[PDB]
Write an enzyme that holds these catalytic residues in place. Structure first.
Site, PDB file in Angstrom:
ATOM      1  N   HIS A   1      14.691  -7.073 -25.159  1.00  0.00           N
ATOM      2  CA  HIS A   1      13.397  -6.538 -24.741  1.00  0.00           C
ATOM      3  C   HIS A   1      12.461  -7.658 -24.293  1.00  0.00           C
ATOM      4  O   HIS A   1      11.994  -7.681 -23.149  1.00  0.00           O
ATOM      5  CB  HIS A   1      12.795  -5.739 -25.911  1.00  0.00           C
ATOM      6  CG  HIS A   1      11.642  -4.866 -25.535  1.00  0.00           C
ATOM      7  ND1 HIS A   1      10.339  -5.200 -25.827  1.00  0.00           N
ATOM      8  CD2 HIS A   1      11.595  -3.657 -24.932  1.00  0.00           C
ATOM      9  CE1 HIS A   1       9.534  -4.247 -25.395  1.00  0.00           C
ATOM     10  NE2 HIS A   1      10.271  -3.297 -24.851  1.00  0.00           N
TER      11      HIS A   1
ATOM     12  N   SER B   1       6.497  -0.643 -21.728  1.00  0.00           N
ATOM     13  CA  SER B   1       6.762  -2.052 -21.979  1.00  0.00           C
ATOM     14  C   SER B   1       7.156  -2.793 -20.710  1.00  0.00           C
ATOM     15  O   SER B   1       7.005  -4.016 -20.651  1.00  0.00           O
ATOM     16  CB  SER B   1       7.882  -2.203 -23.015  1.00  0.00           C
ATOM     17  OG  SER B   1       7.433  -1.861 -24.312  1.00  0.00           O
TER      18      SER B   1
ATOM     19  N   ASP C   1      -6.085   1.895 -18.414  1.00  0.00           N
ATOM     20  CA  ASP C   1      -6.832   1.161 -17.405  1.00  0.00           C
ATOM     21  C   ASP C   1      -6.130   1.108 -16.066  1.00  0.00           C
ATOM     22  O   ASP C   1      -6.791   0.995 -15.032  1.00  0.00           O
ATOM     23  CB  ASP C   1      -7.084  -0.277 -17.866  1.00  0.00           C
ATOM     24  CG  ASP C   1      -7.960  -0.344 -19.082  1.00  0.00           C
ATOM     25  OD1 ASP C   1      -9.142   0.044 -18.977  1.00  0.00           O
ATOM     26  OD2 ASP C   1      -7.469  -0.789 -20.136  1.00  0.00           O
TER      27      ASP C   1
ATOM     28  N   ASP D   1      -2.795   7.368  -5.589  1.00  0.00           N
ATOM     29  CA  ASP D   1      -1.479   7.419  -4.972  1.00  0.00           C
ATOM     30  C   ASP D   1      -0.399   7.912  -5.921  1.00  0.00           C
ATOM     31  O   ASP D   1       0.744   8.109  -5.494  1.00  0.00           O
ATOM     32  CB  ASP D   1      -1.117   6.039  -4.427  1.00  0.00           C
ATOM     33  CG  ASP D   1      -1.906   5.697  -3.163  1.00  0.00           C
ATOM     34  OD1 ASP D   1      -2.161   6.630  -2.372  1.00  0.00           O
ATOM     35  OD2 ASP D   1      -2.267   4.522  -2.982  1.00  0.00           O
TER      36      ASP D   1
ATOM     37  N   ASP E   1       6.644 -10.351 -28.473  1.00  0.00           N
ATOM     38  CA  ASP E   1       7.758  -9.421 -28.359  1.00  0.00           C
ATOM     39  C   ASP E   1       8.903  -9.854 -29.250  1.00  0.00           C
ATOM     40  O   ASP E   1       8.670 -10.434 -30.314  1.00  0.00           O
ATOM     41  CB  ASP E   1       8.193  -9.344 -26.890  1.00  0.00           C
ATOM     42  CG  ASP E   1       8.712  -7.975 -26.499  1.00  0.00           C
ATOM     43  OD1 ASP E   1       9.893  -7.693 -26.789  1.00  0.00           O
ATOM     44  OD2 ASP E   1       7.955  -7.182 -25.903  1.00  0.00           O
TER      45      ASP E   1
ATOM     46  N   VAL F   1      -9.019  -4.108 -24.098  1.00  0.00           N
ATOM     47  CA  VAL F   1      -7.848  -4.740 -23.508  1.00  0.00           C
ATOM     48  C   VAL F   1      -7.377  -3.877 -22.345  1.00  0.00           C
ATOM     49  O   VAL F   1      -7.938  -2.808 -22.076  1.00  0.00           O
ATOM     50  CB  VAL F   1      -6.738  -4.945 -24.546  1.00  0.00           C
ATOM     51  CG1 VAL F   1      -7.290  -5.755 -25.713  1.00  0.00           C
ATOM     52  CG2 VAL F   1      -6.187  -3.628 -25.022  1.00  0.00           C
TER      53      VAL F   1
ATOM     54  N   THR G   1       0.809  -1.211   0.000  1.00  0.00           N
ATOM     55  CA  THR G   1       0.000   0.000   0.000  1.00  0.00           C
ATOM     56  C   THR G   1       0.845   1.264   0.000  1.00  0.00           C
ATOM     57  O   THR G   1       0.291   2.360  -0.105  1.00  0.00           O
ATOM     58  CB  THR G   1      -0.928   0.051   1.218  1.00  0.00           C
ATOM     59  OG1 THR G   1      -0.175  -0.156   2.421  1.00  0.00           O
ATOM     60  CG2 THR G   1      -2.012  -1.003   1.114  1.00  0.00           C
TER      61      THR G   1
ATOM     62  N   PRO H   1     -10.224  -0.296 -26.579  1.00  0.00           N
ATOM     63  CA  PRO H   1     -10.804  -0.140 -25.232  1.00  0.00           C
ATOM     64  C   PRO H   1     -11.011  -1.446 -24.475  1.00  0.00           C
ATOM     65  O   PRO H   1     -11.084  -1.402 -23.242  1.00  0.00           O
ATOM     66  CB  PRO H   1     -12.140   0.583 -25.489  1.00  0.00           C
ATOM     67  CG  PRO H   1     -12.441   0.392 -26.934  1.00  0.00           C
ATOM     68  CD  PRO H   1     -11.121   0.199 -27.641  1.00  0.00           C
TER      69      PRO H   1
END
Length: 279
Positions: free
Chosen positions: A69, A224, A200, A260, A39, A177, A16, A175
């Site tokens: 990557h 990424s 999101d 936060d 990837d 995903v 937290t 929208p």
């Protein structure tokens, strides 16, 4: 379970509060789940994957990660030391070449491959795809990510690193995903992170330590790097039975640390991925 001296990103997703260094997670650790890493590949021989990684598809002359990557992202999903879901199975889909670029048509083919390939794998706890990639807006790229989601895979995609509204980037702007922005260890929005209503969730994205090619490790930054945190978390929560592929993004947002983060533009979610593990 408790992993002391964990990477800050792992400690953050089980806290937290920022500024701690232990990663707390249920011992199930994503056992019985699968995460596809779409990837540059995965260096599956890396000791950090303990034999749980494997390349399942490539569109180039090799399935090896000649870039790093993809190995880095895979390590944040599920490597023993750097991973969120330390017992998940990792499947590599190399849609990006060793320079880290890939034609959109190849990326689309990789996503549809996963939507089918999951029927060839044992993932009784559920399936996740991590898309640490992006480019300009493309309806077709968005639709491919939407199909993957529709097919029962928890799709997490990078918001992008343009410090701009993600509405103009794909598959970030799809929208349906889970579009993932990046935060740093002081709970600030990463300088580069895209933002906007299509985001999101945020996850650790700045100075993320994970596996690299050549059996090594390194710290790098980007949305990424936040995406596999969320992908790993989804796999972890699915294994716990807390949510499913179709609702995991929503569940993660519902259970996230709220309000936060700093430097979050008006209209963008102030939500930081959180596993709510009570040790």
């Amino acid at each position: 379970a408790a992993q002391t001296n964990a990477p800050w990103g792992l400690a953050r997703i089980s806290s937290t509060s920022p500024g701690t260094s232990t990663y707390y997670y249920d011992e199930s650790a994503g056992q019985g789940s699968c995460v596809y890493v779409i990837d540059t590949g995965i260096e599956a021989s890396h000791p950090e994957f303990e034999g749980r990684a494997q390349m399942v598809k490539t569109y180039y002359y090799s399935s090896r990660d000649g870039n790093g990557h993809g190995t880095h992202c895979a390590g944040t999903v599920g490597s023993r030391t750097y991973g969120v879901a330390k017992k998940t199975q990792l499947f590599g889909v190399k849609v990006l070449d060793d320079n880290g670029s890939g034609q959109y048509s190849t990326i689309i083919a990789g996503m549809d491959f996963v939507a089918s390939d999951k029927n060839n794998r044992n993932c009784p706890k559920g399936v996740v795809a991590s898309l640490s990639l992006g480019g300009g807006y493309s309806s077709s790229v968005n639709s491919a990510a939407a199909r993957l989601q529709s097919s029962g895979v928890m799709v997490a995609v990078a918001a992008g690193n343009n410090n701009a509204d993600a509405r103009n980037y794909s598959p970030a702007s799809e929208p349906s995903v889970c579009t993932v922005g990046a935060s740093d260890r002081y709970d600030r929005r990463s300088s580069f992170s895209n933002y906007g209503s299509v985001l999101d969730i945020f996850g650790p994205g700045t100075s993320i330590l994970s596996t690299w090619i050549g059996g090594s490790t390194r710290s790098i930054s980007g949305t990424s790097m936040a995406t596999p945190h969320v992908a790993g978390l989804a796999a972890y929560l699915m294994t716990l039975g807390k949510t499913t592929a179709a609702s995991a993004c929503r569940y993660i947002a519902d259970t996230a640390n709220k309000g936060d983060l700093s430097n979050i533009p008006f209209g963008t979610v102030n939500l930081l991925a959180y596993n709510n593990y009570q040790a």
